[PDB]
RNA sequence: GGACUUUUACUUUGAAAAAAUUAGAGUGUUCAAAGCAGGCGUAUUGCUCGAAUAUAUUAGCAUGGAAUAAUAGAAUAGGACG
RNA sequence: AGGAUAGUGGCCUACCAUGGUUUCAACGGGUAACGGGGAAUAAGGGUUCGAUUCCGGAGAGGGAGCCUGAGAAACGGCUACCACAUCCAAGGAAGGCAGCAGGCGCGCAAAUUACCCAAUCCUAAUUCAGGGAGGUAGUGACAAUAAAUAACGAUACAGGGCCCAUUCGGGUCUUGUAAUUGGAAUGAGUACAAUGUAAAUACCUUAACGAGGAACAAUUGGAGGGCAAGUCUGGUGCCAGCAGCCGCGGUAAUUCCAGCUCCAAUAGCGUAUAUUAAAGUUGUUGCAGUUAAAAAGCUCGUAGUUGAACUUUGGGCCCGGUUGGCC
C-alpha cells in the first residue's frame, strides 16, 4: 500500500499562509461584567432580532 | 479581638507552672541557648560508640598518634 | 501483634469520651485498672474535656504530680488511671466530689456530690467464690476483692463499700421492684425499675426494665446496676435520671428554657 | 413463564447464566482476561514514551487522498514497535529521528480511528516540549 | 495518621451542556442577579436538589411519623429563618415547589440593592468586595450570604468604612495632597 | 425448681452490629467546604445549653404472630386417656 | 494410648480401622487479589473500585534457625546459607531506608538530605529526659470551599409614554452607544507595628505607599451536523491538513492555515486511558429467540427448579387505647 510519499511537502500550507498581525483591540472585560455585557447585547439591547435572534451575521 | 488569659495568686506559682515559652516571651526567665537537634543527635550518636569515660582511650589514641 | 498494644488513635477511642477528630492523632490510652478501658474515663480526659480545669497533658501532670486529685480515698497520681462508673473522685481542694455516673445519651456527667455521700460506693458483684483456706470472697465490677461476706449475697447484686475501708455496709439483691442503672449498649443510662427476668439458660439472661414514664425496654444482664429499690436510690441520681427524652420534647424543652 | 426460573430458591441458576452471558460481552471479557495487561502495547497504560525510529507517508483510506506524516517508534517499556499519528500542520519538522516522544491513544479505545489505516497513537511531546506549543511556537525545541 | 479533613463539592453541572432554553434563562437570572459564573446558580440548583430530595423521602413516609416531623419541620424553621419561604407556606410542598430565585432574592447582593444603598446588584457586589458593608456590626464580603430575615434590620454601611465615616479614603486623601501641593 | 416438651422457613419488635464516612438535628467557621463548637449576665465574683438521631445487609440471639410453603403423627393399632 | 505444648487437637509418635471432600463446583489453575469499615456513579434495583488517614492480618533482600524476655521465630536482635554489596597497611572487618529526609534506576507517573518536642500521645527509675511517632513550615493547579479582573456620574446620539396638541418646537422620567470627560471606591502588591508561633512564615488586624488603560491587560476549546456560535475576508487547491462519528478539501472550502466577529466554561479548560450512568446493548426488577444473533434432530431421564384442593369459620358480650366531634 502507499506508506511512501512526499514528505516534503508537510508544512506547505502553514508556511505559505501571509503573516496578518492581529489588530490591537479595545480591553474586553472579565467576568461579572462580561455576563452583564451580554446579559444587554442579547436582552435589552436586541440589535440584532433579524427574524430569531441570530448572534453573529454576515455583512449583508 | 479574643484571647485566653490567666492571673495567678503569686509569681511563684506563675513561675511554676507557666510554660517557659511563654515566660521567655513575656521576658521573666531568659531563652537558654542550646544547639540544633541535629547536633545534639549527633553528639550522643558519638558518645554511644565509647564505653565509659573515654580518658584512657583518649590518651591511648594521643599516645598511638604518634605510630 | 507481638505483645500489647500502648497507643491508642483517635477514631479509635470510645466516642462517649466526646475527643475531636482534630487535635493530635492519638488518644489517651487507659492505664490497666479497675475497669475495662472502653467503658473507663481517663482523668485527663475528665479534668481538661470535662472540667475545663486544664488545657494540656503538662498541666494535667502538674496538678496530679502535686497529688491533689484522689479517687476512691487513693491519690493515684497517674495521667491514665481508668476511672469507671460509680468511681468517686475527690478534690480536697475546691473540696469538689464527683460520681462518674452515665448521663442518658451514654456519656459520664460531672455529677457534684456531697461528701457523706463522697464517703461510699456501690459495686455490682460479678463472682462469688472460696478462697483458699476455705475464705470465701466476692469480686465487685471495679475489679474490688472482699472477703467474708455476708452468705446471702449472691451474684448480681450490689453492695456499699465504706471507700475508707473495703468492708460492705449493707447489700441490695436483685429481684422485682429495684431500681437498677443501664450501664451498657444502647440503653445506656436509662434507671427502670425490673418487672421480671427471663432465663434462657445457655447465655445472655435478659431483664425487662420500665423507667418512671412507663416505657419499658429489654436489656442483657450484664449491663444492669441495681441502685436500691423504687423510689428512693441509694445515691444521687444525676439531672433528668434517665427518662430518655426523644428528639421532639428534647428541642420541646429547649424552646421552653432558652 | 418469560424463559428463566422464577422460583424463590432459583438464585444459583440465574446467577451462573448471567455470568456466562456476561463473558459474551465485549469490555467485560476484555476486561477479565487482561488483554491490556497482555496483548496492548502501552500495557493499559495511558500514555507511553518511545524512541523515533523512522518517517512514514502512511496513506489516507477511501475516499480521501492524503498522506498523513506518521512516525514508527520502538517503546522503551517493551520493545514494541509501535506506529504514531503526528497530528498537526508541519510538526513532522519536529520529531526528526531518534527522538523520545511521547505518545497517548487516539480516542478511539484501540481501534484505528479514521481514513488512517492501522495507527492507534498520537504524539503528544517530544523531547519533553509539547507538539502544540512547538507549532504556535511558545516554545522551542530543546538541545538534542 | 491523623483524621482527614472532610469536604464536599456544592454545585453539579448539567447533563446536556448545550441548550438554549437553559442557556438564556440562567443567562437572564445572572444579568439579573449581578453574578459571575452559571456555578452559583448550579450551586443552588445543587442545594434545592438536596432539600427537594428531603422533602420527597420525608413525604414518602406518612404523617404522625417521628421523623417526618422532626426534621420537616426543621426544614421548614430553617427556610423560614432564612426568608426563602413565606410564613403561611409551610405545608412540606411549598418546598418541593421552591425555585432559584427564591433562594437569589435573599443573597446580600440583591438584598443591598433592595435596602437602595447601591443603584444595582453591581454596585451591590462591589460593595460588598469593597468592605462598605455591615450585615451587624460586622464586614462581610461575600455576596452569597443568605441573610437571615431578622439581619435586614442591621444591613448598613460599616463604621470603619467610607460611607461610614472615620476616614475619607484612599484617593480622596491623594487628592487633598494633590490640591495641597496646588495650595503651595 | 420440675415432667415433658413435632420440626422449620417467613415476618414484627428488641438486644447487638467501634469510630470515622453517609443521611440528618442544632450552631455566624464573616458566607461556605468545614468544625463541634458555643451562648448569656450587673462581664467587678460568674451562670448555662450541647457535642442528638437514623441507617448499618446476610449470618447468629431473644421475642409476638401464626396466614402462606413445607414437615411429623393412631392403620399387620407393640394408639391416647386412666 | 503416650509424647510435646501454656493448653485442645494427627500437633507428633506407636498400634488399629478405611475412612474424609465433591455438579448445592470438591480438587486444580488464574487474580494486573491483603480483607473489612468504606469510595465513585446511581429513580429504584445495581455496576465498578477499595495499595492508601481507622480496625485486623503478613513482611523487613529470599529462606531457615534461635538467645533474652511476661510478650519476638524480633530483624533500627543475633547465627548460617543464597543473591547483591562496603572498607582494607589483603591479615580481616562490617552489611540490611517496604522508618524520616534524600540519591540512582524503573518508568505516563508522585515533594525538603528544613525547624521543634510548643501541642496529641508514648516510654523510662520518671512532673524535669527522649521521641524524623507526631506537629510546624517548604514543594505542591491531586482533589475540594469562598471569590477580583471594575462601579457610579455629567456631555453627544436613538428611543417610549406624558405636559403642552401652537407648524417636526421644548422636551421633563427613561434604556442603550461614544478617537467624550470626571471625581470617588477598592484590593492584589510592598510594609512601621502589633497579633500569630517553641521560634518564625503566612492568615485576621493595621500606620505609610499602592488603577486609567500602552495599565494591575483571562485563559482553554470551538463556530456544517450531533452540539452554543459565520454563507465574513485572504491563502491552499483530493495538496497541506481537519475530522470522537457522519464527513470537508479536486481554483468561488460556512469543516484546512490565518485575520475579524461570535459562542461555551472560566482561574480554569482541553487531551489520553480506565470505570459508572446513558445500557431495558446482561435485562431479579427488566431483554430477545418465525424471518434481524439465537428453540438442542427427537424422546426418556437423575441432580436442580416448581408442584391440585382440603382441617376454627362465623356469631355474640364486655373492657379499655388512637384519630376525630360542637362543647
Ligand atoms: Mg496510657
Ligand atoms: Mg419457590
Ligand atoms: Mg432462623
Ligand atoms: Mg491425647
Ligand atoms: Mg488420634
Ligand atoms: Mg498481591
Ligand atoms: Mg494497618
Ligand atoms: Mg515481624
Ligand atoms: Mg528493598
Ligand atoms: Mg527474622
Ligand atoms: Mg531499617
Ligand atoms: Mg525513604
Ligand atoms: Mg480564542
Ligand atoms: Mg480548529
Ligand atoms: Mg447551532
Ligand atoms: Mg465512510
Ligand atoms: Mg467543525
Ligand atoms: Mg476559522
Ligand atoms: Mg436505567
Ligand atoms: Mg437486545
Ligand atoms: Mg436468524
Ligand atoms: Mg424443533
Ligand atoms: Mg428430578
Ligand atoms: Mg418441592
Redesign the pocket.
Given at each position: 500500500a502507499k506508506v511512501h510519499?512526499?514528505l516534503a511537502?508537510?508544512?506547505?500550507?502553514?508556511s505559505?499562509?501571509?503573516?496578518?498581525?492581529?489588530?490591537?483591540?479595545?480591553?474586553k472585560?472579565?467576568?461579572?461584567?462580561?455576563?452583564?455585557?451580554?446579559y444587554?447585547?442579547?436582552f435589552?439591547?436586541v440589535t440584532l432580532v433579524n427574524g430569531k435572534r441570530?448572534?453573529?451575521?454576515?455583512?449583508? | 479581638?479574643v484571647?485566653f488569659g490567666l492571673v495567678y495568686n503569686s509569681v511563684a506559682e506563675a513561675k511554676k507552672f507557666e510554660?517557659?515559652?511563654?515566660l521567655?516571651?513575656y521576658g521573666l526567665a531568659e531563652?537558654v541557648e542550646?544547639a540544633?537537634?541535629?547536633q545534639?543527635?549527633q553528639k550522643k550518636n558519638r558518645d554511644k560508640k565509647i564505653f565509659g569515660t573515654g580518658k584512657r582511650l583518649a590518651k591511648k589514641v594521643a599516645r598511638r598518634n604518634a605510630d | 501483634?507481638?505483645?500489647?498494644?500502648?497507643?491508642?488513635?483517635?477514631?479509635?477511642?470510645?466516642?462517649?469520651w466526646?475527643?475531636?477528630?482534630?487535635?493530635?492523632?492519638?488518644?489517651?490510652?487507659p492505664?490497666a485498672g479497675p475497669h475495662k478501658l472502653r467503658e473507663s474515663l481517663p482523668l485527663?480526659?475528665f479534668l481538661?474535656?470535662?472540667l475545663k480545669y486544664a488545657?494540656?497533658?503538662?498541666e494535667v501532670?502538674?496538678i496530679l504530680?502535686?497529688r491533689h486529685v484522689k479517687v476512691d480515698g487513693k491519690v493515684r497520681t497517674d495521667?491514665?488511671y481508668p476511672a469507671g462508673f460509680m468511681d468517686v473522685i475527690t478534690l480536697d481542694a475546691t473540696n469538689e466530689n464527683f460520681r462518674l455516673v452515665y448521663d442518658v445519651?451514654?456519656?459520664f456527667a460531672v455529677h457534684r456530690i456531697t461528701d457523706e455521700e463522697a464517703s461510699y460506693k456501690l459495686g455490682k458483684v460479678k463472682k462469688v467464690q472460696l478462697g483458699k483456706k476455705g475464705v470465701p470472697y466476692v469480686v465487685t465490677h471495679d475489679g474490688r476483692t472482699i472477703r467474708y461476706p455476708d452468705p446471702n449475697i449472691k451474684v448480681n447484686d450490689t453492695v456499699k463499700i465504706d471507700l475508707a475501708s473495703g468492708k460492705i455496709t449493707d447489700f441490695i439483691k436483685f429481684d422485682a421492684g429495684k431500681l437498677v442503672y443501664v450501664t451498657?449498649?444502647?440503653?445506656l443510662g436509662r434507671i427502670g425499675t425490673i418487672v421480671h427476668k427471663?432465663?434462657?439458660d445457655?447465655?445472655?439472661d435478659?431483664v425487662h426494665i420500665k423507667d418512671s414514664l412507663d416505657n419499658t425496654?429489654?436489656?442483657?444482664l450484664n449491663?444492669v446496676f441495681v441502685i436500691g429499690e423504687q423510689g428512693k436510690p441509694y445515691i444521687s441520681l444525676p439531672?433528668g435520671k434517665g427518662i430518655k427524652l426523644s428528639?421532639a420534647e428534647?428541642?420541646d424543652r429547649?424552646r421552653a428554657?432558652q | 413463564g418469560?424463559?428463566?426460573?422464577?422460583?424463590?430458591?432459583?438464585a444459583?441458576?440465574?446467577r451462573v447464566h448471567?455470568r456466562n452471558?456476561?463473558w459474551?460481552?465485549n469490555?467485560?471479557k476484555?476486561?477479565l482476561l487482561?488483554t491490556?495487561?497482555?496483548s496492548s502495547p502501552?500495557g493499559?497504560?495511558?500514555?507511553?514514551?518511545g524512541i523515533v525510529l523512522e518517517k512514514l507517508?502512511i496513506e489516507?483510506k477511501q475516499?480521501?487522498?492524503?498522506?498523513?506524516?506518521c512516525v514508527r517508534v520502538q517503546?522503551?517499556?517493551n520493545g514494541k514497535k509501535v506506529t504514531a499519528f503526528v497530528?498537526?500542520?508541519?510538526?513532522?519538522n519536529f520529531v526528526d529521528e531518534n527522538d523520545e516522544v511521547?505518545l497517548?491513544?487516539?480516542?478511539?479505545?484501540?481501534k484505528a480511528?479514521?481514513?488512517?489505516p492501522g495507527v492507534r497513537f498520537?504524539v503528544?511531546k517530544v523531547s519533553g516540549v509539547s507538539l502544540?506549543a512547538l507549532?504556535?511556537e511558545k516554545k522551542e525545541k530543546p538541545r538534542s | 495518621?491523623?483524621?482527614?479533613?472532610?469536604?464536599?463539592?456544592?454545585?453539579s453541572t448539567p447533563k446536556?451542556?448545550?441548550?438554549?432554553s437553559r442557556?438564556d434563562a440562567?443567562?437572564k437570572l445572572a444579568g439579573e442577579f449581578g453574578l459571575?459564573?452559571?456555578?452559583?446558580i448550579?450551586?443552588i440548583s445543587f442545594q434545592l436538589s438536596?432539600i427537594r430530595?428531603?422533602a420527597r423521602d420525608l413525604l414518602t413516609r406518612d404523617e404522625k411519623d417521628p421523623?417526618r416531623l422532626?426534621?420537616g419541620n426543621?426544614?421548614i424553621?430553617?427556610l423560614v429563618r432564612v426568608g426563602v419561604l413565606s410564613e403561611d407556606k409551610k405545608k412540606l410542598d411549598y418546598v418541593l415547589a421552591l425555585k432559584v430565585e427564591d433562594f437569589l432574592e435573599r443573597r446580600l447582593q440583591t438584598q443591598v440593592y433592595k435596602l437602595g444603598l447601591a443603584?444595582?446588584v453591581?454596585?451591590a457586589?462591589?460593595?460588598i468586595?469593597?468592605?462598605?458593608i455591615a450585615?451587624?456590626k460586622?464586614?462581610?464580603?461575600?455576596?452569597?450570604?443568605?441573610?437571615?430575615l431578622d439581619?435586614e434590620k442591621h444591613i448598613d454601611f460599616a463604621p470603619?468604612?467610607?460611607f461610614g465615616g472615620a476616614?475619607?479614603?484612599?484617593?480622596?486623601?491623594?487628592?487633598?495632597?494633590r490640591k495641597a501641593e496646588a495650595s503651595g
Open positions: 510519499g512526499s511537502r508537510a508544512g506547505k500550507v502553514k505559505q499562509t501571509p503573516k496578518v498581525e492581529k489588530t490591537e483591540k479595545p480591553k472585560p472579565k467576568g461579572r461584567a462580561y455576563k452583564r455585557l451580554l444587554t447585547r442579547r435589552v439591547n441570530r448572534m453573529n451575521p454576515g455583512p449583508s | 479581638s484571647g510554660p517557659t515559652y511563654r521567655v516571651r531563652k542550646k540544633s537537634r541535629q545534639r543527635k | 501483634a507481638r505483645g500489647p498494644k500502648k497507643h491508642l488513635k483517635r477514631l479509635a477511642a470510645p466516642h462517649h466526646l475527643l475531636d477528630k482534630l487535635s493530635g492523632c492519638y488518644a489517651p490510652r492505664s485527663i480526659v481538661r474535656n470535662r488545657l494540656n497533658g503538662r501532670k502538674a504530680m502535686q495521667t491514665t445519651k451514654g456519656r451498657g449498649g444502647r440503653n427471663e432465663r434462657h445457655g447465655g445472655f435478659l425496654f429489654v436489656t442483657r449491663n439531672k428528639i428534647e428541642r429547649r428554657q | 418469560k424463559g428463566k426460573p422464577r422460583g424463590l430458591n432459583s444459583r441458576k440465574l448471567r452471558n456476561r459474551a460481552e469490555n467485560y476484555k476486561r487482561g491490556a495487561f497482555k502501552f493499559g497504560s495511558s500514555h507511553a514514551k507517508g489516507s475516499p480521501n487522498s492524503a498522506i498523513r506524516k517503546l522503551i517499556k497530528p498537526n500542520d508541519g510538526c513532522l511521547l497517548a491513544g487516539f480516542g478511539r479505545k484501540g480511528k479514521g481514513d488512517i498520537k503528544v502544540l507549532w504556535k | 495518621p491523623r483524621a482527614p479533613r472532610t469536604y464536599s463539592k456544592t454545585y446536556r451542556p448545550y441548550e438554549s442557556l440562567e443567562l459571575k459564573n452559571k456555578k452559583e448550579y450551586r438536596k430530595r428531603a421523623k422532626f426534621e426543621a426544614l424553621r430553617r443603584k444595582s453591581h454596585h457586589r462591589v460593595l468586595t469593597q468592605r462598605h450585615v451587624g460586622q464586614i462581610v464580603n461575600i455576596p452569597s450570604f443568605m441573610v437571615r439581619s470603619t468604612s467610607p476616614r475619607p479614603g484612599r484617593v480622596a486623601r491623594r487628592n487633598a495632597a
